[PDB]
Amino acid sequence: SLYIFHSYVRKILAISKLYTPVNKYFPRALLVALGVDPEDVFANQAQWEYFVNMVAYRAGAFAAPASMTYYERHAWMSNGLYVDQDVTRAQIYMFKPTMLWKYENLGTTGTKLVPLMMPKAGDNRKLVDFQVLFNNLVSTMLGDEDFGIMSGDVFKAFGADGLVKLLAVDSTTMTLPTYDPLILAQIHSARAVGAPILETS
Amino acid sequence: TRNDVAWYARYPHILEEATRLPFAYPIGQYYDTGYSVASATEWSKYVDTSLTIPGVMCVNFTPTPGESYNKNSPINIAAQNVYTYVRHMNSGHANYEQADLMMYLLAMDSLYIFHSYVRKILAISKLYTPVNKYFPRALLVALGVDPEDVFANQAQWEYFVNMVAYRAGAFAAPASMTYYERHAWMSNGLYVDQDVTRAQIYMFKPTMLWKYENLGTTGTKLVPLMMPKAGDNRKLVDFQVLFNNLVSTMLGDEDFGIMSGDVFKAFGADGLVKLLAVDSTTMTLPTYDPLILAQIHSARAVGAPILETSTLTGFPGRQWQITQNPDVNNGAIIFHPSFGYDGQDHEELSFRAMCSNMILNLPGEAHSAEMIIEATRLATMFQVKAVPAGDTSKPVLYLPNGFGTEVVNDYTMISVDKATPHDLTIHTFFNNILVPNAKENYVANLELLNNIIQFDWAPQLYLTYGIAQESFGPFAQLNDWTILTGETLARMHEVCVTSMFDVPQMGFNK
Amino acid sequence: TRNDVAWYARYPHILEEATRLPFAYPIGQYYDTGYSVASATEWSKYVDTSLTIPGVMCVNFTPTPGESYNKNSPINIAAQNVYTYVRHMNSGHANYEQADLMMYLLAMDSLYIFHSYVRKILAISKLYTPVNKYFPRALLVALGVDPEDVFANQAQWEYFVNMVAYRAGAFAAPASMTYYERHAWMSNGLYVDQDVTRAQIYMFKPTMLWKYENLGTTGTKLVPLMMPKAGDNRKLVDFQVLFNNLVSTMLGDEDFGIMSGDVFKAFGADGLVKLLAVDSTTMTLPTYDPLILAQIHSARAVGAPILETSTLTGFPGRQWQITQNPDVNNGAIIFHPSFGYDGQDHEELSFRAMCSNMILNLPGEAHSAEMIIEATRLATMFQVKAVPAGDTSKPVLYLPNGFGTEVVNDYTMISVDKATPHDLTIHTFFNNILVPNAKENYVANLELLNNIIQFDWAPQLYLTYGIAQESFGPFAQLNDWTILTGETLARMHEVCVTSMFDVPQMG
């Protein structure tokens, strides 16, 4: 969920620098669909750009294996801009998390992952909302010594070279939309299961 | 001598299964050992199951120009040499004297130390490790910074450090003067005590910095500007206020502008101190440096700096000051500070245990001259008591017999708590530690001693018990040692302060 | 673009003349640092100018066959194994059982430790170093001998040790049974804590030895025979009556000769334990051995041996005894001592600090299995409390969860006094030190602590205070530690008791 959140805010940052004369949906419609106020990322580009790097830095306190292709799949999904036909003014597909799994420790009677809802496509959320979401996500992880012991164990077992490396972005970092017929074959024949059920639902 | 057991070679499977032990416990968190005897919970405090390994010892220092009470001091000789090179060998201006140029060069060092300080604050906050949970919050607490502020405002911190390095470039200072290189190398490094994976970390933090003060024609001061202490939780706005207060009397002074242009002209742009820029990829890994460890071992804490608002009965005019006056004392730069102050208006009677001659022990059996001269840089021996102005005086002050380019004020150690929150604990201490007669001081002092002996080349301790009216001497593990007296350490201090303020870029001694 | 010469290379004579200091002070010597203020003589004890450096820490041990409660013990399985090896190599009908052979085989170990002890007393006395003034008198005081008696009566001492080697060398014991080789390795050897010339020295001295005490048809009972402690100025007559008390039941005896000849026929003359001979040129040098230092660092002292004359209020019949009786436990060798004794019939409140789980600390980060299991040999953890009898008990006793082929009773440290005439000071301690509430013993306890931390791999201390009602945990510096529970140490103890008593292959 941390890696998906990093790819999410990284795609928010990489979208806002995209302007094209042939596509006036860029970048505001992609930013609205991700749930972000598009004027906030323009007015606070340095703050967004450094918050994404700080997320990638503080995620490095926890070790996770890199050959586990679960992480690579979720990062490849939630960061790409996917074009539908490979022409100039083609349609764009994205992947956005509806919710993320927030870690919950019950002590000796178990351990939960509970839903943390992400902003929806009309919400117009600023950087402070995404900072509150990231602080709420890593709140029960950085102070847990079970997580610290497990992190040191994964670090020792896999080594520093065999861990997931959330890479840094600079001011020159751009994502162009790509043509991927595997992504299109996923979107075709996809089945929406409905809204997640919460404990207040 | 012990031929190897052949049973271990014939049955290595049983030996491997019997000795599968979890080593490499990560440091930074509390560990409980448990109970060998399960009924020993009835003996509650008589059984200790706690294990608190510490990570950070911050050495809190004051930058000094050396001891100076006459014109024959190393700082005055350096003032004469740099004024001859700037004023006469290159065509300098004639509106300032040698003490003015030397105090400008001394005020530039506080700027460089502040830059290394906030640069180390920035480089620490990006360090996270599974094997060391002290990183980075304990290093950030020991430097006096709110650790969540540097995480939440990383871009603002990162650009403030670069802006400090940019605005410091308005003033010229020579690069071959190794005073600046020494202070920048000290106050930026993370120093590891044993060169292993989860070893202990030493830092150097300024206790105060020298703020420039112009009195006009009746002299020129350097006054103390106190830095934040290890519990303060200061944001970026506090460090910005500190940097604005430091360069407030420097950017609008045309004496400083003339002296800056003269140093620029005399040394050239290539021969100046260049505070280098940091990017987002800038990291400091901790290093192993046995010269730094030989400095921290045999270091001597002199106590708190005396301020003009500090209350010292019997000592009204003893505030720490780098002063020059053309009428007073041939126009020499004077730094004659009194030591043994503990921040309170009473006698810290454990400083009485700092009145014996010191022990300087080194690793190995063959010590070079460079090693012996490096290992004495933070050592400071008292020489006489200060004379109280009157007959009633609660504190006891000490005059030294010279000191190096920096004196230690304090040490701050960060460890985890053994009580049920197990948070970070902040203890500040001198080399001298008073254990007063109270029921709860002995176990706390023993925990302090056991945390200190985890640090490899720790400072040597001097413990005073109030119940016995007796001090115990150097609590340290010795090696190849000597006994140093005051004149030998004074000669070594003279040598090092002369070598630090020498600028080989000058046309002197060729 | 020319880097000019630095100040230290422009004046190298100034740097080399300011830094010429006399290093390498001899240890065994009081040093006064003097005053740096020199007005501070008005502050009499508030200024400490003394500098005492210790030289000897003697580990005082008891040799053990391991814990034994029934015939399923490793000492009894080893008795079975060595008895079927010896009996199936000797033609004839034996008259001794397996337990008689193993009790003989432990009594021979106590003889060999005695011989190594007196040969150590001899070979120490020829050691001289100008930079170590603890040689040889502090080593001799730590072994409990009068040092002047060894120098005055050198030829008689050499005759006594050579006659002990001749009279104990008449009995046979298997050389490929590493119990003897390990006990000889401990009892013959001086060990530096660091590989330097002015290093601190570790020794191993027996606290007691096992005396045979034949009983007849009601079995066999190895009894304690106490060795002299440090500070006792014992002469050659005392070690002679100790040797004569150790061999009075087995020197010219027929059963010990038959068992010895059977061991001598089973294992060849090359397969027997060889005692070292001593001339007037025999010297043992201090050596650097990290395995010795690893097991000293994780040593836990179990306390004094309980004797039959020792008075314990709520504990009758708890004396240390390797017993054997066909009436009890089907003729098994039985040894289960209780720990936590120090003399002094009351509770030593400091042994409560030994009820935590121990910390096994090593240097580096890569630890082999041999290093890990050798570092746990002198470690002994309590498991439960012993049950008293009478509802009124002054001491508190503890039962272990197994122990190795030896247990540590005590440590004795030899330093120099800081008061004149600066003679040797003798301090005996466990891992657990009680600091009662008096003004005298706070600075004394701090001096003991600073003396102990001079030793590089000193045993980990536990300190309790009287007014605090509180013990402090492991007073030691840790590098790469793990926490041992009693079951892991019990498994390592069972493995090492099995490996020490192992016989080769034939039947």
Swiss-Prot record, chain C:
Gene Ontology CC: one annotated term: T=3 icosahedral viral capsid
Annotated TM spans: none
Processing and modification events after translation: The 7 kDa polypeptide is acetylated. Autocatalytic proteolysis releases a post-translationally modified peptide that remains associated with nucleic acid within the virion. This peptide is observed only when nucleic acid is packaged in the capsid.
UniProtKB keywords: Acetylation, Capsid protein, T=3 icosahedral capsid protein, Virion
InterPro entries (alphabetical): CP_picobirnavirus (IPR048835), CP_picobirnavirus_sf (IPR049178)
Record site: Cleavage: 23-24
Role: The capsid protein self-assembles to form an icosahedral capsid with a T=2 symmetry made of 120 subunits.
Comment field (misc): Picobirnavirus particles are capable of disrupting biological membranes in vitro.
Subunit structure: Homodimer.
Protein name, UniProt field: Capsid protein precursor
Source organism of this protein record: Human picobirnavirus (strain Human/Thailand/Hy005102/-) (PBV)
Gene behind this protein: Segment-1
